[PDB]
Amino acid sequence: SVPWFPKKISDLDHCANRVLELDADHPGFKDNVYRKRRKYFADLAMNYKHGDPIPKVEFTEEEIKTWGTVFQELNKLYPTHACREYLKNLPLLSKYCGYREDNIPQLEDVSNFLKERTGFSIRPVAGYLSPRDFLSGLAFRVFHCTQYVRHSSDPFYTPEPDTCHELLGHVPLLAEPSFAQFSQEIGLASLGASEEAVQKLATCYFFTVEFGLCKQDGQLRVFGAGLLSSISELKHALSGHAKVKPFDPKITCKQECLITTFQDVYFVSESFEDAKEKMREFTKTIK
Ligand SMILES: CCCn1c(=O)[nH]c(=O)c2c1nc(Cc1nc3cc4c(cc3[nH]1)OCO4)n2Cc1ccccc1
Ligand SMILES: [Fe+3]
Structure with missing residues (x-):
């Protein structure tokens, strides 16, 4: 008995809305206005259906300032920390999708860019x-993406994904063919798989x-989106203070995923091609 899984891209309409409302420690937990804004974003996503243009949003001055603060600091780090594929694609996004300190890119524009690439x-x-x-979603090369901005009280830390994390952390690597293939194959392996395997x-x-x-080229570089959108952990990950192990699915899948702190350990892939090959070998063992 295989569980239901999407068979075409529009079938994501039937699971994308199955969302399992801020956590007590959220910076906006007591902020009625921010709460209202988040309801606005959540409704845009709930009402979206495959085939729709993604609704364009007029971001507030406050939201754009928060994005600018994060964008400015992270861009200082990327040349010395990010992998070559990230650095190759980030300028294309400045050119074609309006990545600037004073402008938050629209998801529809970024989506059209990725579709082409x-x-x-x-x-x-x-x-x-x-x-x-x-x-x-990944099986159909769909990335489920948050559209809201983190609360302006703490631009540097966010307990959840926000659109700064999506646009700065995830998108430049989805524009890379080898990474896109790697990501899609995780999705494909998951379709109708056991709970254990998922x-x-x-x-x-x-x-x-x-x-x-x-x-x-013999150096350690960052490609993880959660690192690429966190100023403090991006630096930590390539400092001598971090524990590092080779990526090895049978070992890596035993590790706990930490959400509110730095990771205890980071895994090093040899290349996106090699990570993809290692996953192919691994998935055979869990089908
Ligand atoms: C299968 C992987 C786990 N996983 C899941 O099971 N379900 C998801 O919906 C999911 C997810 N992962 C991410 C995307 C994501 N990026 C993150 C980056 C982070 C993070 C959590 C993240 N979740 O905390 C540290 O930095 N999402 C999207 C998401 C959207 C809105 C709120 C939370 C998560
Ligand atoms: Fe993420």
Whole structure:
């Protein structure tokens, strides 16, 4: 008995809304106005259907300032920290999608850019989905993406994904063919897979797509989106203070995914091609 899974891109309409409303420690928890703004974003995502243009948003001066603060600091770090594929694609986004300190890019523009480059596209998502449903988007080269901005009281830290994390952390690598293929194959492996297998694929995703390191020309570089949008952990990850291990799915999938602190350990992939090969070998063992 295989569980239901999407068979075509529009089938994500039936799981994208199955969202499993701020946590007590959220910076905007007591902010009625921010709460109202978040309801606005959540409704845009809930009402979205595949085929729609993604609704364009007029961001407030406050939201744009928060983005600018994060953008400015992270861009100082990227040349010495980010992998070559990230650095190659970031300027294309400045040119074609309006990445600037004083402008938050629109998801529809970024989606059109990705569609041309690698066939990836964006779907706005209200909030957290099951790992099964989130990974199933990747099978159709769909990235479920938050559209809201973090609270302005703390521009540097966010307990959840926001659109700064999506646009600065995830998008430049989805524009890279080798990474897009790697990501899609995680989604494909997940379709109709056992609960057990889905969880293991989710953890492998976490320690590559979200917090991965890679080796390039003998150096350690960052490709994980969660690192690329966190000023403090981006620096920490390439400091001598961090614990590092080679990416190895059978080992990596045993590691706990930390959400409110720095990771205990980071995994180093040799290349996106090699990570992809290692996942192919791994998925055979859990089908
Ligand atoms: C299968 C992987 C786990 N996983 C899941 O099971 N379901 C998801 O919906 C999911 C997810 N992962 C991410 C995307 C994501 N990026 C993150 C970056 C972070 C983070 C959490 C993140 N979740 O904390 C540290 O930095 N999402 C999208 C998401 C959207 C809105 C709120 C939370 C999460
Ligand atoms: Fe993420």
